[PDB]
């Protein structure tokens, strides 16, 4: 009960930059790679869905096992190290899938390159398992360093979100820079495109940054070897359970009122966020710029242009995220509580999701005066990018406050940090599958386009604000 200094908590929070780099990398390089491999869109949907499913499975099991690690290296360091090593292996397998597939039998003038697709899928599965092995114990290790100090936990998670934004900016700048392959001239082969070579170079830089921020962090911070308390032969803790739902249901039944209310507020928060976070680039390429991936060559060109402009919007968003993360705790304190700031920024999210309709109206008006395939004006561009920028404020709270509150409640109750966070992750990965599988049908139900999902998400965000301000209990 005597906290490790801030220097070590921030050293542990700094690994989020190296983790987020490897994902932000892929925004403008994964789609051309999927085109190059020729993966059928149904198989692509399955590969993508493997993400949230693996988040459902790995997170609680890893949390429950990390809370009982008993290793000499600590409760959290072994899992983080294993996750980073598996990230390295997954990078190696994803970047080189096309070249192996070619050298193993794939034909150059054949659309569906089978062997390359198999290697690609194995790589992403390893990466999913690695990410879900890493995420839990790292924030749990922050919670261990805080040793019951609520303010220290809040500061730790604010810095975690800050480093996430740092890694996002770095990966967005690398992934969108053509001619990066000039670093390694032999990245381009007969089966590897220029974007493939940029992907390889970005993955090299990813392994580099990850080693840099991880080795130093795990040598620099000591992880305290855990000792289990003595037990009888007739105890539940030395008794086997259901393989996967054992940890989840055990978490749910030792649970408190505050944890239930926090999970509800977080689930509604992510049901609000994921429509935009999943369909924003399509909204930009379709509603805002005009054009479809199908149709005449200009409309395909305009769709590509809209997607690029959306990537720039996300860049602005991450910059704003990083700047807000540094003031989260002070602003929350002066407002009289972190959940107060949560509730307040959720209404900003609601209004921002509402502004989408006005942007779309301005774009159709310009398209009527200047032509259907004339593209947007500078005003429509500026407005869409301003929306992307402003939305960075609530995302900073979403990336910090819920995990900190989970940790504080689990410290008061004694639940266990790793498994509390692994169960909190359900309120993120279940809305993800709901939105990804029901967005299209829901939009079609209400006329088409992207906007109905955005209006329902705005209402959900306002409801999240109300509940965070009223039903969510304050910490002790």
Numbering used by the authors: 25 to 500
Relevant lines from the article:
Whereas the SWEET facilitators efflux sugars, active loading depends on SUCs that use the plasma membrane proton motive force to drive uptake of sucrose for accumulation, with concentrations reaching as high as 1.3 molar in the phloem. SUCs are part of the Glycoside-Pentoside-Hexuronide (GPH):cation symporter family that belongs to the Major Facilitator Superfamily (MFS). SUC1 is predominantly expressed in reproductive organs, trichomes and roots, where it localizes in the plasma membrane and is required for proper pollen function.
In the asymmetrical unit, SUC1 forms a non-physiological inverted dimer, with both monomers in the same conformation (root mean square deviation (r.m.s.d.) of Cɑ atoms = 0.1 Å). Overall, SUC1 adopts the canonical MFS transporter fold with twelve transmembrane helices arranged into two pseudosymmetrical halves consisting of two six-helix domains, the N-terminal domain (N domain, M1–M6) and C-terminal domain (C domain, M7–M12). The EHR is anchored to the side of the N domain by a disulfide bridge between the strictly conserved residues Cys216 and Cys220. The structure captures SUC1 in an outward open conformation with a conserved electrostatic network between the N and C domains at the cytosolic side. A large and clearly defined V-shaped cavity, which spans approximately two thirds of the membrane plane between the N and C domain, is open to the extracellular side. Overall, the cavity is electronegative, but it becomes electropositive towards the enclosing bottom. Despite the presence of sucrose during crystallization, no defined density for sucrose binding can be observed in the cavity. In the transmembrane domains of SUC1, the only acidic residue is Asp152(M4), which is strictly conserved in SUCs and therefore the prime candidate as the proton donor/acceptor residue during symport. Asp152 is exposed to the cavity solvent without any close contacts to other residues.
